[PDB]
Each structure stands twice: as C-alpha cells, then as structure tokens.
Design a protein around this ligand. Structure first.
Ligand SMILES: C[C@H](OP(=O)(O)OC[C@@H](O)[C@@H](O)[C@@H](O)Cn1c2nc(=O)[nH]c(=O)c-2cc2ccc(O)cc21)C(=O)N[C@@H](CCC(=O)N[C@@H](CCC(=O)O)C(=O)O)C(=O)O
Ligand SMILES: C[C@H](OP(=O)(O)OC[C@@H](O)[C@@H](O)[C@@H](O)Cn1c2nc(=O)[nH]c(=O)c-2cc2ccc(O)cc21)C(=O)N[C@@H](CCC(=O)N[C@@H](CCC(=O)O)C(=O)O)C(=O)O
Ligand SMILES: C[C@H](OP(=O)(O)OC[C@@H](O)[C@@H](O)[C@@H](O)Cn1c2nc(=O)[nH]c(=O)c-2cc2ccc(O)cc21)C(=O)N[C@@H](CCC(=O)N[C@@H](CCC(=O)O)C(=O)O)C(=O)O
Ligand SMILES: C[C@H](OP(=O)(O)OC[C@@H](O)[C@@H](O)[C@@H](O)Cn1c2nc(=O)[nH]c(=O)c-2cc2ccc(O)cc21)C(=O)N[C@@H](CCC(=O)N[C@@H](CCC(=O)O)C(=O)O)C(=O)O
Ligand SMILES: [Cl-]
Ligand SMILES: [Cl-]
Lengths: 327, 327, 327, 327
C-alpha cells in the first residue's frame, strides 16, 4: 500500500513545506497539492516543497485543462520535474463547476477536453513536436525546449465515464471517496476502460483521496472531520447518498445550515455517524487501519490522507507514520 | 535612473538565480523573466529566484492574458509577492502571434482583453470580490483568499495604441526598443493615454527593454548582439525600419537567411552597423553610457539590459554594476 | 524601539524559518538564534532562515569564542552576510559554564578571550590580514578571501565587567534580563565602558533579551513563563535575587524541585508572582506594553521576545505585531 | 566505480549549488566541499547545496578536529543529515600546517586527535552520551538532543600512518593522489590497518581525490591543471616528490613564485610535465578513462574529480557524465 497526503495552499508554502518534509520522514510516498485560483499558486507552492524535500514524490492533485493552456501545464510540471530530480507527478481533473463559474469559465466537454489535454501533455513531456486538431484542443508544431524525463499522469475522477476514461489513459486515478462500496463501483469502471484500451488494469494506481482524521482520542478525530464531511454530503449526487443509506433530504438540510453558516447545527447532530462512516476514514489508528485494509481488499493501491488529516496536522502526520505506515 | 535585467528560462532556474543574486549585489533594481510555454515556467522560476534573493524586485516580463486565466495570474503573482516579502511586480503584454499560433490560440482583441485583464487583476490583488462582464473577460464573484499587498503592473507595448493604453492604466511600460527616436514616439503616446485618464504622466516608469551587449572589447560586444538584432529587424514593422533609415528590403533578406539558418550570412554582413546602432545598446561601457543618457533625456526612467547582456553574462553583469550603475 | 525575537534550534530549521518569516511580516527587526552543540548548528539554521526571509536582520544570539576558532566564526557570519544580502549581525558571548563542562572546555579568561576574538573578527570582516599574539588568541597572516560587507557585533553580557567591555567595543549588548532595575545597573556599566573608550554611549543598541510570554489571557501567559522563570531564578546570583527582593533561599528550594523534576511544585506556587514580575515580560498586551515603556525610559533600545514568546508561538508573534509593534 | 566531485567555497554557495545539481543530473554519487577559514563556511555552503539537490550525497572534504570542537562538528553534519534526508557524509582529515599556522593553531598529535575525534563523533551521531578522557579529546556527559540517522565517516590521509589508521576506523579514505603507484602503497597501508582492526578491508571506500582536468583538447586541459598541480607540488613531502622523480628543489622554486604571486611563472615553466603526470588525471575522455581503469585495477572504488575539473566547469561536468560515468 502506497501512502499520500494532501495540502491546500490556503496556508503559506513555507508552512506546507514543513508538513511535506515531515511526511517524507514519516514514510509517505506522495504529497498532493490542490489547485484553485483563490489560494496560492499550485506551482510556486510545489517549487518550495521540491526545494525542501528530497525523495518524496510531489504534484498537483489536481490541476485542470481550462485555467491554463495544456502547453503551460506541460512546461510547469516539467519544470518541477527538473528542480526536484524527477519526483514530479501530474494530477489532472476536469475542474469543479463552482470554481469555474466564478472564473467565468464554460465547462465545455470535460471528457474530450481532458483526454485531448492528456494526450498533448504526454507528447510534450515526451519531447515530441505537437500538432493536434481535436474537438477541444489544438496545437500547431508546439514543442518544449528542455527535457522532462518521465512524468506519471493521474486523473481525478468521480463520474462513471471519467473513471472509465482513466482506466483507458491514466497511470493512476485520484478518487474522492472513502468507502469500499464506492471503490467497488470505481474499480469496475476503471477495468472497463482498461480493457477497452487493451492494457492491464493493474497498471493503474487506484487511489483513495479520502477525508482523513486520526487521533488517539476518537471523538477528537470525528469532530475534526464533521465540517469537511458536511461539505462532502452537501455535494454528493443522490445516487451516492443512496448507496450509503443516507436520507437524500439530509443534503438540503445540511446545505441549508452551511448556507446560513450554522456550523453549530452541523456539529450539533446534522452530521450523523452514518455520514462520517461513509465519507471519511477516521477515528483511532485501529479504526483507520480497518478501513484501509477493507479498501486494499477492494483494489485500492494508494491511500491519501486528505483534509483535515487530523485535529492537528503535525501530530496526525506522526501518528499515521508510526501507527499505520509502519504497517 | 533605475536598472533592470532580463533572463530567459531556457537555462535552469538554479543557474538564473545566481545571475539574479549577482544583479542584486551589483545594484540592479529589477530582474525580469520571460514567459513562453516552450521554456521553463515563469512562476516556478520566479519562486527559486525569490528564495535566493532578498531586496531586488522581481517579476514576469511579460506574461499575458491568454495562456492562463487572469485569476490564475493574480494568484500566482500574489504568491510570489508573499514568498518574496512584497518584491513582486507584474509585467503583462498581449503576447506574440508566433507563440500563440503554435499554442492554437486566437489572438482576439489584444487591446480590450489586456485592459479587462489588468482591471480584473488589480481588483483581485486589491482583495475585492470580482464581477465582470466585459467583451473578452468575465468573472462572477471570484475572490482571492489570501492577501496580496501591493503589486505594481507594467504593460509590455510596442504599438501606438498599446502605448496609449499603458499611459492610461499601467504603473510602467516595458518597451522593446533601444533608440531615442523610438522612445520619442512612445513617450508621446504614453502622455496622450495619461492625459486621457487624467493622471500625471510622470507616474509611469517608462522603461527601455533593450537588446544589451557590453564588454571592454567593443567588437566582442557587437558580435554577441548580431543574431538578436537580426530577429529584431526581421520582426520590425516597415514604419520602424523606416524611422532608422534601414532598407525595408533588408528585413526579407534577413528573414530569408534566418529561415535557411544561414547565420553565417547574418554575421557576415547582413546585420549592418546601422541595424546594431538602432536596435541595441552595445559596445564598451562608455558607448553604453552615452546611449543611456540619451534615453534619459528623452524621458526613459528604467533601462533593462536584455539579451544577450554581453559576451558572457557574469562578467557583463559586473561590468554594468561597476562601470554604469555606480553611475 | 527595535523589536527582536529568539528561536532555539531544538526545532528543525524549516519550522523555525516559518516563525522567522512570520516575524518579518509582523514588523520585527531581528531574529536571534541560540548556539549550543546539543541542538542544530547555528549556521545551517541561519542559512535556511536567510533563504526564507528578505529584509529582517538575522544572526547568532549568541555564539562564542571557544567552540569554534574565531577565524571560522568570521568566515561563517560573513557567509551568511553574503547569502542574505547583508542582513547578518553577530552575537558573541563568553558561553555558559554548564555547556562548556560537557564539552570538556576550560573557560579560560572569558574577558580577554572575548575582547581579542572580537578584535580579530572585526579585522577579518574588514578585509585585513590578521596578525595577533594576545594572551588568548593568536593569528599569523590569516585573511578572508571574499568580501564581508558590514557586520555589526553585539556582545552577550550579564556581569558588570562584561557589560563594561561591551560599552567599550560592541555595537550592541544582549542582556539576559527583563526588569528596569537590572537595566538601570547595566546602562551605567555600559556607559563607563563607552567613556573609557571615548565613544558616544548612545551608539550601542542596549537590548533586553527577555523571557517573554504574551496572550490575551494573562494567566495563560504567566503559566507559559513559569518554568523558564524557574530556571532563571535557579541560576541567578545572590546579588540579583537580592535586588528584586526575592528570598535567596528560594533559589535552593527551586533548584531542588528542578533537580527532582517536581514541576508540579514550580507551577504550584514555588514560582512567586514576584519572580515572574522581576524575570519576565509577560501578561496581556497591555501588561507587556507597560513593562516595555519602563525599559525604554531606562535606555533600552531593542526588546527581544525570548522563549517562550507565548503559549503558542504563531499566535504570540501575531499578537506582538498587532498589539505592540504597531505601537 | 563511484564518482565524486570537489568544489571550493571560493565561489558563492549559490553558484556551487548549480554545479552540484548538474553533477547530480550527470550521475555523480558524491560532491565534496573543502573547509578553510579563508573561504565560505563549509556548512552554510553544504546547507544551500542540500536544499538545491535531491539524491546526491554531500559532505565536507575534509573538515578537521582543530578549528571546531568535535561536538560542534557532530551537530553540524547531523544538521545537514536532517535537512538533506540522510545524504550527509563526513570527511575528516588532520588539517594542513599552512592554514593552521595562520590560525595560530598548534598541530598537536594529529593521529591521536583524529582517532579520538572520530570515536567521539561516531558516538554523538549514534545518540550516546559521550564521556572521554583521551590524550587530546575529552567530554563529560555531552549528548546530542536530536537524531542523526546514519552518517559514514571518511578520513583524509596521505601519510602511511594516517592511511593505516583509516583502514582501522574509517568508512572511506580520501587520498590526495592520482597515480597508480601512489595507490599501490596506500592500499597496503589501509589493508594493514583493516587487519589490525579485524575488519574486512573491502569495506572501506578507497577514493582518489585527484586533480582532474578533462577537455576534448588535451592541451587546454593540462593548462587548466598547472596552478592546482603547483600547489600540490609545493606541498608534497620530499618522500613523495622523490617517489615521482621530481627534483626536491622544484618545491622551493615553485613555492617562491607562489609567495611572489608570480602565477605567470607556474604557467610558463616551473610546473613541468613530469609534475602533471605525477599529480593529476588530465587529457581527453579516453586519456582519463585509461587512468581511471588503472586505478580501479589497483583497488580504487571512488574517483573524485577535484579542481580544476576542466577548463570550464559546466562543460567538464557534462563531459564526465557523458563520456565517463555512462562508462
Ligand atoms: C465532469 C464531471 O466529472 P466528474 O469526474 O464527476 O468530476 C467531478 C470532480 O472530480 C471534478 O470537478 C474535479 O476536478 C474536482 N477536484 C478538484 N478540482 C479542482 O479544480 N481542483 C482541485 O484541487 C480538486 C481536487 C480533486 C482531487 C481528486 C478528485 O477526483 C477531484 C478533485 C462529470 O459529471 N462527468 C460525468 C458525465 C460525463 C459527461 O458527459 N461530461 C461531458 C463530456 C463531453 C465529451 O465527452 O466530450 C458532457 O456533458 O458532454 C461522467 O464522468 O460520467
Ligand atoms: C497587439 C499588438 O501589440 P504590440 O504592442 O505591438 O505587440 C508587440 C509586443 O509588445 C507583444 O507581442 C509582446 O507580448 C512580445 N513580448 C513577449 N511576449 C510574450 O508573450 N512573452 C514574453 O515573455 C515576451 C517578452 C517581451 C518583453 C517586453 C515587451 O515589450 C514585449 C515582449 C498590436 O499590433 N497593437 C496595435 C493595434 C492593436 C489594436 O488595434 N487592437 C485590436 C482591436 C481590439 C478591440 O478593440 O476589439 C486589433 O488590432 O484588432 C497598436 O498598438 O496600436
Ligand atoms: C564571563 C561571565 O560573563 P557573564 O556575563 O556573567 O556571563 C553570563 C552569560 O552572558 C554567559 O554565560 C552567556 O554566554 C550565556 N548566553 C548564551 N551562551 C551560550 O553559550 N549560548 C547561547 O546561545 C546563550 C544565550 C544568551 C543570550 C544573551 C546573553 O546575555 C548571553 C547568552 C562572567 O562571569 N563575567 C564576570 C566576571 C569576569 C571576570 O573578571 N572573571 C574572569 C574574566 C576573564 C579574565 O580574567 O580575563 C576571570 O578573571 O576569571 C563579570 O562580568 O563581572
Ligand atoms: C598529519 C599528517 O597527515 P597526512 O595524512 O599526511 O596529512 C596530509 C593531508 O591529508 C592533510 O593535511 C589534509 O587535511 C589536507 N586536506 C584538507 N585539509 C583541510 O584543512 N581542508 C581541506 O578541505 C582539505 C582538502 C583535502 C581532501 C582530501 C585529503 O586527503 C586531504 C585534504 C602526517 O604527518 N601524517 C603522518 C604521521 C604524522 C605523525 O605521526 N605525527 C604525529 C601524530 C600524532 C600522534 O602522535 O598521535 C606524532 O606522532 O606526533 C602519516 O600519515 O604517516
Ligand atoms: Cl531570500
Ligand atoms: Cl532538496
């Protein structure tokens, strides 16, 4: 089992560099950095992380094909590959509608766009002169002027079609879920895509980009996760809420409280233990270990400790290293 | 007189950081970094520069509004402002047609786009929630989540209209020219724009983004600048070649030789001494000083030593520091 | 009033770099780093601080003349001056007997050694070829091979004689005290030394290297400072305890409790409010401001927030910046 | 065969960091940094190299037991081990008489001092509380307060006794020589020491710390080496000079010209081709490969490209990577 961790550039990069360094010392394999125009740049951030780490792999989790031309993304991830000595990996997703509305971006044909963008990027990184005339992406003789070395590409995917596409073209899949039921479905979609492309499905690093919260005190752990779990439930499609036996009505109820900023309600009972059990990996190290082994049995090969990671980051990272990674 | 220097990310960022540090030690005020998808990322590069410098101002010279959404540009330059302690400055231009053709980008309405992008960026950096519905740029409630501090914005401009627009909205103008005749025309355009906006024209940092080549041996200096002068002449609009008494036919002749890669012709006599005198600041420290003071008299407030800088960068940077900046 | 802050390399340098950066943003003038063989190297630590800061002054507080040959100290502080663009300042003291016993070092003639070491160091930094044949320090034609620029030298001093020597040769004095009574005596000593050397006593930056603990909640503040105050009282010479009306017997009682590790006694009443008032600057921002202005009236020109700084570092640094430095 | 490279801090650390990064990309295993009070600090330099590299091993080549108390050396190399993620290696030698004279340091019992210092350092790094009462080095309960991980220790040695001691206690030996004849003798000495200690002699990394100069043009190569070779000669014991048929007169001759600053002399005659063959590995890649394979057959396991490396460093580092390391 590979282990990764996620940091949001809502903190200065220098502070994140320390968490990433700590992760490297604790045995993590990957640190992933979110990309949203409203927080710090994903690349200046990756640059200070690369300078302050030595062996851990790093990369965006996930950037997209719309806020930056794919040639710029290729050049950027390659730059981080050079600075870090080949530890860069590219996480690309279609982007989320909310962020795009604010940016005045037309989310047009996510599927085709993403596939074309990844094809173009793989060719750039590969050193080829790129010429494309796709339904969304086009290049006429573009080419990088420095060498990239090898850069794995992971797709961010939730929907059945994106999952299938990931099995067809990605080296890994970052899935925003925490429960075995969700990965049971995801693994099948990835498998269909893998066969459709004729590649061995076990080639793809199926990873759980989970809401993670660990602590020796389980109630301290769940409390740190409630708000995040709330936002997850608020944005979960009916189909998913269904799968976990969670009243679809609870979504509106929670969306409401969030709209009103009534976090007192969220902590007060709105976030039920069922929501916590279905949308996060939390509790004591034992609780988290059990969930992790269930995911392993279903075919998950990398587990990423996503926000909040735990009540206090530094202590949680150490807990994970000592009580989990050291298996 | 302020002094700046330009570096192209066709060299690894670590090597550029040393040149930048040396420039800081030699008394330069600004280092500017070019932005082209085919070289290293302008931002990962600015990040390593920021970490290895302390007081010199830094920034892209120049990025654009098309290869990255303006919100991403705001976030990135603000990120560099945070890391460097407020030493970031933003250089924005409309971009060059050649690069955009390769990237499959429609250069649509450079003027309106650039104006709207700068208005949006100033608002982001300023901490406002941005809502726009311009003819090229739109945002719906977008807003940065961290504070930017103050970030001056410089426009890259060559054409009369861009120049006028810079006088109307920018804090400085990076003009790709080297001769007083060109700046005589540019200063008038900037002045028209400044009056059109009701601001004091002396607020804008009129800067000469020149082709610079300095050495104790003048012939070593001109030879280092010929190829660059060639590309400048090849892309100069008839109107400009005219102004310097350079046969407009020479442009085709040189464009030809460049197409065939016959640099032996370029060095052999195609680049005339007249072209060198009109499109570059080069020679010995005295020659360069004379030209610089001529530009100063015309109203130039910042001189940037652009490529090649000199036969060997390290020695040239020291020469400029010792024989020019120390006035 | 200048403001400084102290960090002990008992934390990794990367974590300290963030606190130092924060201090820079909060308006501090100096960050000082302690030097003891048992924690991280004072210089590798200053190196990562220099790379992650831009304007704040940095330096050891304080290193000494025994654990490293003075020529090495000269070279090291000059190396940090180069990397940081001239923000290095040298804090040198005679060293503490406890640390030296462990290192098997004979604390021989602190006074003469310190004076000779500082004379040699000033000459190295100044570019001179050094030749000395003092009663403790000797050099025969030694000389730095790179330029240092200017580096102020601060002496660490507690005793009347060291204080006098500081007034005679240092640019500043780091005094381990927090109460006006102690600085009343110190300022006289520094003045005697200043006159003995014929220099204007107001040239020296008289600074209070104080035990500092600030918080909106005063009791949270004093509790964070008790253990540190305990060790201060435990090591205070009878003369000093006397000056603050503190039973000299309390020193043994506290030393005992410390020996037995009975910190429950220290928190339980052993550390009296009188000890807290005489050996630390703590309480709410108002309490701290009052003490600071008392020190200012006595002639203190720099106040350093030494350990613990506050219940939690990050929050305390921000408190000091907002409720104190912004005067 | 392992490959290493040496840099002297007579250049700013930022510039060295690029050469080190390049070496990492070109396949070198080790970069070694010299330690002399007159150049930049060996540790601030190692700190910037560590931040700008990722996998290559780094360390002082070589520091000593006299200019810094061994506990400080332990703490410093441990600090670099932490920052670099365990890539630190310690090179310790007895120091050279010329540097010590200038520093006013009595070179007392190099052998016992070096052995005791290494024993103390291994114990510090190992986490032990150190107590020693040797004939040169003493400690009373000293102990590091942070964990070092593993740090190999290499000894710098030329003399037969130092070589024997290295075989007895070191993990590797950095020998200042370039010719098989010298390594034939050294390997025997190291073997005697290894048997005296009962360890397998093939445990020690016998390395040639050679004067190296490589270039497609053998003559520009040997000219780049003349100065370094001059200093190597003027410092060779007559036992050595005699070993290479070089007139023991040529040392006073060369030494004189050095004191005079007469480098024209060294370049135009005093440094003979006998001296170049005797004390350096230089010519074309083929010439260098032949010599390297000769050393390999004699038992050398690491070859370090020491100054000048080649006519121009950057090009030489690439030549070695391409035409030698890629074997
Ligand atoms: C587009 C969407 O795909 P999705 O996989 O559900 O996307 C939801 C989220 O994964 C997506 O918004 C992400 O980018 C969110 N996201 C982040 N997004 C960010 O922008 N930044 C982040 O840091 C972030 C982190 C992150 C980590 C992992 C992860 O999986 C997601 C993350 C969708 O609904 N797809 C459906 C429908 C497909 C469909 O038909 N879409 C197009 C296809 C058009 C064509 O085929 O050309 C259509 O309508 O025509 C499907 O996959 O079946
Ligand atoms: C668009 C063009 O502008 P220009 O200023 O002449 O363009 C030349 C360059 O400044 C521009 O191509 C640059 O971005 C090139 N450039 C680089 N370009 C890059 O992309 N990146 C770099 O790193 C680079 C370095 C550089 C440094 C400084 C600098 O001055 C320019 C640099 C132009 O022709 N403008 C005309 C007319 C423009 C016009 O009329 N507007 C639109 C109408 C828009 C509307 O109203 O709807 C039209 O032409 O259709 C004018 O200035 O009057
Ligand atoms: C030497 C000593 O000076 P002192 O000022 O009392 O020393 C106390 C401390 O300053 C000394 O232990 C420090 O180095 C502690 N110290 C640190 N020391 C460290 O080793 N590391 C640190 O990072 C640290 C932090 C610190 C910060 C500020 C500061 O004020 C000093 C700091 C002393 O006792 N001096 C007396 C007596 C001097 C005297 O005449 N006796 C000696 C003088 C030598 C001679 O005769 O020439 C002799 O005769 O034996 C006096 O000043 O009156
Ligand atoms: C002391 C001397 O040792 P040596 O090994 O010949 O020393 C020559 C060099 O290795 C030594 O001066 C180095 O520190 C030089 N040196 C550097 N030294 C530096 O100071 N800085 C550097 O960065 C540097 C570069 C370098 C890299 C590799 C390398 O091998 C050496 C380097 C010597 O005389 N050794 C004799 C024995 C001497 C002896 O026995 N005398 C004493 C021994 C102590 C005792 O009695 O126990 C005596 O018996 O009294 C021997 O090896 O047989
Ligand atoms: Cl910096
Ligand atoms: Cl690194």
């Amino acid at each position: 089992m590979k282990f990764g961790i996620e940091f949001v550039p809502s903190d200065p990069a220098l502070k994140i560099a320390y968490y990433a360094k700590l992760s490297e010392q604790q045995g993590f394999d990957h640190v992933w950095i979110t990309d949203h125009y409203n927080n710090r740049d994903v690349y200046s951030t990756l640059t200070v992380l690369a300078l302050n780490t030595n062996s851990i792999k790093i990369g965006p989790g996930v950037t997209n094909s719309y806020t930056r031309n794919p040639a710029i993304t290729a050049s950027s991830i390659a730059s981080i590959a050079e600075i870090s000595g080949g530890r860069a990996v590219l996480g690309l997703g279609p982007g989320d509608k909310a962020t795009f509305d604010a940016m005045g971006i037309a989310w047009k044909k996510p599927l085709a766009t993403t596939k074309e963008a990844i094809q173009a990027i793989r060719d750039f990184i590969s050193g080829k002169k790129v010429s494309m005339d796709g339904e969304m992406i086009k290049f006429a003789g573009a080419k990088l002027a420095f060498k990239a070395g090898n850069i794995p590409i992971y797709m961010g995917a939730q929907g059945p079609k994106m999952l299938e596409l990931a099995g067809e073209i990605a080296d890994g899949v970052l899935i925003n879920a925490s429960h075995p039921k969700d990965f049971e479905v995801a693994v099948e979609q990835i498998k269909k895509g893998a066969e459709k492309a004729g590649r061995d499905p076990s080639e793809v690093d199926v990873t759980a980009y989970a809401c993670f919260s660990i602590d020796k005190d389980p109630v301290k752990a769940v409390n740190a996760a409630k708000v995040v779990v709330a936002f997850i439930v608020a944005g979960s499609p009916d189909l998913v809420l269904e799968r976990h036996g969670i009243p679809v009505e609870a979504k509106s109820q929670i969306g409401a409280a969030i709209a009103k900023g009534d976090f007192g309600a969220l902590m007060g009972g709105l976030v039920t233990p069922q929501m916590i059990e279905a949308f996060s990996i939390c509790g004591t190290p034992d609780d988290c270990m059990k969930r992790i082994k269930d995911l392993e049995a279903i075919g998950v090969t990398q587990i990423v400790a996503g926000s909040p990671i735990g009540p206090a980051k530094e202590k949680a990272i150490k807990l994970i290293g000592k009580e989990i990674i050291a298996k």
